[PDB]
Amino acid sequence: TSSMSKGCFVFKPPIEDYFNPEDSKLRFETYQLIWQQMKSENERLQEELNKNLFDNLIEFLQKSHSGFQEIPTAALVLGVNVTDHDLTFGSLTEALQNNVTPYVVSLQAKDCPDMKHFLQKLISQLMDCCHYSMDSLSSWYMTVTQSPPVVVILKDMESFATKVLQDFIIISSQHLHEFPLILIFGIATSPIIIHRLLPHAVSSLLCIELFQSLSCKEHLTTVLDKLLLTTQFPFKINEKVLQVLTNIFLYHDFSVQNFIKGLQLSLLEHFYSQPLSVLLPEAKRRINFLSNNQCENIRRLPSFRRYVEKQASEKQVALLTNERYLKEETQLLLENLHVYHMNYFLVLRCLHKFTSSLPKYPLGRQIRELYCTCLEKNIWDSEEYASVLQLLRMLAKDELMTILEKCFKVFKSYCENHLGSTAKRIEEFEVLRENVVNFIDCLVREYLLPPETQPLHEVVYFSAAHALREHLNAAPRIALHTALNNPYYYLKNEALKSEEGCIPNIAPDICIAYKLHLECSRLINLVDWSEAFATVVTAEMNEIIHARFIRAVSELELLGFIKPTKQKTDHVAR
Amino acid sequence: QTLRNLLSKVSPSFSAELKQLNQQYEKLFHKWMLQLHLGFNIVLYGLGSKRDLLERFRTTMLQDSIHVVINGFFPGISVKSVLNSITEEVLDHMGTFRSILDQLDWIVNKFKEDSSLELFLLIHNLDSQMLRGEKSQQIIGQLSSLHNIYLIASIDHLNAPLMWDHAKQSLFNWLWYETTTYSPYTEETSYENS
Amino acid sequence: CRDLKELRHLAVLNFPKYCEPVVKGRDTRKLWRNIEPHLKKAMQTVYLRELPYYSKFILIAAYLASYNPARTDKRFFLKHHFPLDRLLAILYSIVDSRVAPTANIFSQITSLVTLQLLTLVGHDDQLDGPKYKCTVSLDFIRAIARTVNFDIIKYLYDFL
Amino acid sequence: LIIAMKHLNDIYEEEPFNFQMVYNEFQKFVQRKAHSVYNFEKPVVMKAFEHLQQLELIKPMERTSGNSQREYQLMKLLLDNTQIMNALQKYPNCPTDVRQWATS
């Protein structure tokens, strides 16, 4: 029924069960709860970081409408981050309709190719915000008024045709007295583009003013600090995934939603893979309900087996045989890992506070770079650490005490459990500077250690980065060429192992046909190609060989490697 | 070209490795369903005809839910035909529509009003000549932006990634899976007239 | 500027700075000396009133492809002596690191097309032999080249 | 700009032109003179050309948009040399420099 001439076919006939189970159910519940918290925090951060511009917009609109009681217009630069615009605009309209005016109309360029359709959509949306022409709009405004202005949002003006823009500007200019109108411009490129779109005869009627929005890099730094460098979330990530996500972000899109998607997929795959990922007080109580097969699974861990090898033989036997003692010891190790996470985050934050004022920034500027270079290897084992220390030893006393004041602010804010004597010494303060540097170095050696060096770390870390690459950043050309060139990697048939670049005649028809095509010229003669294919496959029959050749040619033409040419009969270019 | 009918007598080679290859692919159905159900769309790419694998996935897992199959390799398929089919059967509406955009608005409003409707889409050869229109992919992406619609697509053309823009990439929310089946493209080249 | 409306608008805009010096305390020379630099600054605009990494390379390669004849391409890039394939070859030549053909670069191409920096010439249905043209000013490409530490002038055939 | 256009029509007999050539030769004229007060940037000259095209003294050939910008567009003049000379003769305050450039 799925192979008829007509191309339209249609047929008519719990969530957690697809994931399989009780531990799976708990893992699914924890996944949902953690994703809920993560996206709620993301929304909270999104709303917070725009007040300093929203208030300016509100005051500008109030000032502009004060005169009505020349079209006022505000220019808003939003960068290339095409994904962030929708969320920002949602927040923007939630601000205006709550404060100044309940009439906000956002419009696309795709849905407004003509001024007739433009006016139709405009009046249709104005109707439910509470032939068609400007007189009808004026009458509708008079009826609804019988004085709030009207707000219209143009999202993507790059795709807008000019002519409708000039027509709307010139028509609306002559009816400002009838009803107020204000324009808000969202421009992805530099503001210069507005001069290249509107002729001056139309541009002279607008009083444009310029705002600018938040940079994407600061947004990423704030999100990373709030959601990964904090102690409020038990999940952590290995260095490989952080590097690949940072590479994608910084090289491709500068978008945060893609990074959030990658984080969510990492969490999902971590809970799918590790059965022991079911595991602060929740894990404390969940230990008591552990199962014997899971006890054997814990016994199988590589970090756990190295830690057991570290301990004595008697303790080795006790751990390998007893269960409740194993549960208690794993509980203690989990508490130790918690403490390590706490002091690692605090020490890294303090160190970046020290590092932020260093000239030339030897170890980076933001949290992410220092964090990843610390996660890679030990900083203290590199000569760059010595260079940073000797650069630190040249600071002036006033700048040193300013840095100490910032660090003391950090201590008073969230260094609450350990080493208040550090702040006491900071209050007390070349010899003193050298003592401070040596104490900081001692802290760095003591507390900055890779998480891989501690047992049971695999519970809260994920390491399958290659699957993440192949599931997010696909390489169709590379995969197709690998399939075409060396099918041994897919078949493991020794008949295909001769050389690299040579011709395995035992290979399928499509592979040998493609390899014959590769060595030939830029124009492929079909008869000569067929003769070569027959010669290769030779080492009633002619018709079968020709049939295989035709099928291979059709397949290659479908795949796009073949484009027919009429310059020469039976010839194709690449 | 009439000999093509009689050319079908050629036997395949090394079928055992193909059998193990298909068996390996079969185990991913549950994970794919989990990813679809959580709001992700999946494209299958790889050498060989994967129509048989899609049919197997449908007859194994999609026999208990509403599902629509589109075999886009047929040169007579258009987006308006898909919209008419969806309107006439999924929503059981017969009234004609003045424009494609009006039909899309009605469908989006109806699906937003009714949160109990779930639909599965199975599109064969998304890179077809008739579906390469920018408006076609924009319409399909706008449809797939809803959380009540699930999409499985296949790529067979080399320049497919040029179809999708950054905004379209955000709307589609793609995940990728490499599935090379080495199957001949018999049916997909049968309807094609060389 | 002989436009009455525009000159009147300029006067309205600039009058407060005209009247500041007397408020601060009929001195024609004083007023002219205090006000002259502001007039020169105003006349600069009579009628007027950060890309990702690989995007910059795409843009400069597109500019080179648009403004360099094809006959001289090997003369500038081949180590020993417009369609999309030419752009791909030039991009592969320019970048010192091996760049994988990830779909994200195609997404960047399409986004650059959307931003009206690159104009599609061929038919929309023909996405196997597409034609493009670059509409970026020379000063803009020189400025973006400087931020990358690349000398585009050394490769421009027309200047040579 | 009109005098530069006439010079273009004289040097290149009955051929179209664009904005770049006119700008280049106006730059040549203002550069030959030592320190004349004509230090103007590109955007104002572009706006002047747009205004001239608006008055329909210059018409495009084989109209198209999007593919070709306002720059690099084939423009032609719709006036005669004797008309320009007669009009410039009656111009109220034509400076000596521009007059001698026109005569050249």
Side-chain angles (χ1 to χ4, degrees), chain B residues 7-194:
Chain B
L7 303 186
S8 62
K9 293 180 182 179
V10 185
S11 56
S13 300
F14 302 104
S15 61
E17 296 80 3
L18 280 72
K19 290 188 286 290
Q20 290 88 61
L21 183 63
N22 295 116
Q23 296 295 322
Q24 295 295 321
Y25 286 143
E26 283 189 359
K27 66 181 73 174
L28 295 170
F29 294 163
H30 268 276
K31 189 175 179 181
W32 292 355
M33 293 177 77
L34 182 62
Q35 289 173 345
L36 289 172
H37 182 74
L38 295 171
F40 291 111
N41 305 319
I42 296 89
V43 162
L44 294 175
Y45 76 105
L47 182 59
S49 174
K50 65 180 72 66
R51 179 179 180 271
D52 282 16
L53 183 62
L54 293 174
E55 183 178 1
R56 265 307 302 290
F57 167 52
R58 188 186 79 99
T59 189
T60 294
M61 297 298 177
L62 275 295
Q63 291 187 171
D64 316 321
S65 51
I66 303 165
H67 58 278
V68 176
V69 182
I70 301 299
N71 56 3
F73 78 115
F74 174 61
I77 302 180
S78 69
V79 290
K80 69 94 180 179
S81 175
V82 178
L83 296 177
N84 291 118
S85 298
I86 294 166
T87 51
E88 63 86 19
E89 183 148 322
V90 178
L91 297 172
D92 214 9
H93 180 61
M94 190 62 203
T96 68
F97 272 102
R98 305 194 277 256
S99 177
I100 287 171
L101 282 72
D102 187 73
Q103 187 171 208
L104 297 173
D105 296 330
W106 184 66
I107 294 165
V108 168
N109 210 8
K110 181 56 58 66
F111 263 87
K112 266 303 310 174
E113 282 195 58
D114 290 336
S115 50
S116 60
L117 277 295
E118 299 175 355
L119 182 60
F120 289 66
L121 275 295
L122 296 178
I123 298 173
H124 286 75
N125 189 359
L126 190 63
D127 299 328
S128 75
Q129 315 322 312
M130 299 294 93
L131 291 173
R132 285 184 195 182
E134 305 157 314
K135 290 180 72 68
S136 164
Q137 313 285 359
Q138 207 294 325
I139 290 168
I140 297 169
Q142 183 95 9
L143 261 176
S144 64
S145 66
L146 293 171
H147 78 289
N148 292 340
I149 300 178
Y150 312 106
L151 183 62
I152 296 297
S154 67
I155 291 172
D156 291 331
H157 187 275
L158 184 65
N159 294 338
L162 285 171
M163 297 298 291
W164 288 273
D165 191 359
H166 269 76
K168 293 186 183 93
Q169 277 192 350
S170 178
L171 294 174
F172 275 108
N173 200 16
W174 284 125
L175 277 296
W176 305 64
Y177 281 98
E178 182 179 1
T179 51
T180 62
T181 51
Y182 267 109
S183 186
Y185 297 97
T186 55
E187 311 155 299
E188 296 170 5
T189 49
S190 69
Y191 275 132
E192 171 66 29
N193 293 336
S194 199

Side-chain angles (χ1 to χ4, degrees), chain A residues 350-520:
Chain A
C350 298
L351 180 61
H352 178 257
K353 292 294 291 183
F354 283 105
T355 313
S356 301
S357 183
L358 300 182
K360 309 301 148 301
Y361 296 94
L363 282 176
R365 291 193 296 274
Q366 302 312 72
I367 300 296
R368 66 186 183 276
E369 287 182 6
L370 183 62
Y371 181 42
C372 64
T373 193
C374 186
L375 285 176
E376 178 205 89
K377 291 182 181 178
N378 296 320
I379 308 170
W380 51 263
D381 72 36
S382 68
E383 295 68 13
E384 302 174 2
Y385 183 62
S387 62
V388 171
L389 291 174
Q390 67 94 31
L391 290 172
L392 274 158
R393 285 162 162 143
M394 311 313 298
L395 297 176
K397 194 178 179 179
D398 194 1
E399 291 184 2
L400 183 61
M401 62 77 68
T402 304
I403 292 164
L404 286 170
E405 168 56 30
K406 293 308 161 273
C407 297
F408 176 70
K409 279 289 156 302
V410 172
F411 285 105
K412 186 66 174 66
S413 57
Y414 277 105
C415 297
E416 291 192 353
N417 296 333
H418 293 104
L419 294 165
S421 57
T422 304
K424 206 195 96 174
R425 292 142 198 169
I426 291 170
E427 295 143 6
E428 289 170 4
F429 297 114
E430 285 179 2
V431 174
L432 60 88
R433 182 174 65 184
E434 188 62 20
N435 188 1
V436 169
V437 169
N438 291 138
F439 170 77
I440 296 305
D441 179 35
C442 285
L443 295 177
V444 169
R445 312 274 182 124
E446 171 45 38
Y447 297 112
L448 278 192
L449 297 167
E452 299 264 10
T453 61
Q454 287 77 19
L456 277 289
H457 70 88
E458 297 83 354
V459 181
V460 292
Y461 282 94
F462 169 96
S463 64
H466 182 62
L468 186 65
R469 275 208 189 119
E470 280 193 357
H471 283 94
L472 299 185
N473 274 3
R477 295 178 65 186
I478 296 170
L480 183 62
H481 171 75
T482 307
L484 285 172
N485 184 294
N486 62 6
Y488 180 77
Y489 182 76
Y490 294 167
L491 295 175
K492 296 182 182 177
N493 194 340
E494 183 65 26
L496 304 169
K497 264 298 166 188
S498 81
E499 292 88 4
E500 183 178 1
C502 291
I503 322 302
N505 52 357
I506 299 169
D509 293 330
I510 191 66
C511 299
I512 60 172
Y514 171 65
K515 191 171 286 188
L516 289 170
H517 161 60
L518 286 178
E519 291 187 352
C520 293

Side-chain angles (χ1 to χ4, degrees), chain C residues 33-94:
Chain C
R33 286 198 303 102
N34 192 293
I35 285 163
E36 185 277 319
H38 303 298
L39 264 288
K40 195 175 70 60
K41 284 307 295 177
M43 187 176 75
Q44 310 311 310
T45 66
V46 190
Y47 298 126
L48 292 186
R49 201 166 279 97
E50 285 187 352
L51 296 176
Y53 192 67
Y54 291 119
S55 296
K56 315 191 184 48
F57 278 104
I58 295 298
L59 199 70
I60 63 174
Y63 193 99
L64 289 173
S66 293
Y67 288 104
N68 190 356
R71 287 196 331 273
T72 67
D73 294 356
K74 68 208 319 179
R75 150 156 159 88
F76 290 112
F77 305 118
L78 202 71
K79 201 177 179 177
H80 161 88
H81 291 304
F82 65 95
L84 175 62
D85 300 330
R86 185 182 176 191
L87 183 65
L88 294 174
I90 295 168
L91 170 74
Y92 275 121
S93 68
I94 293 167

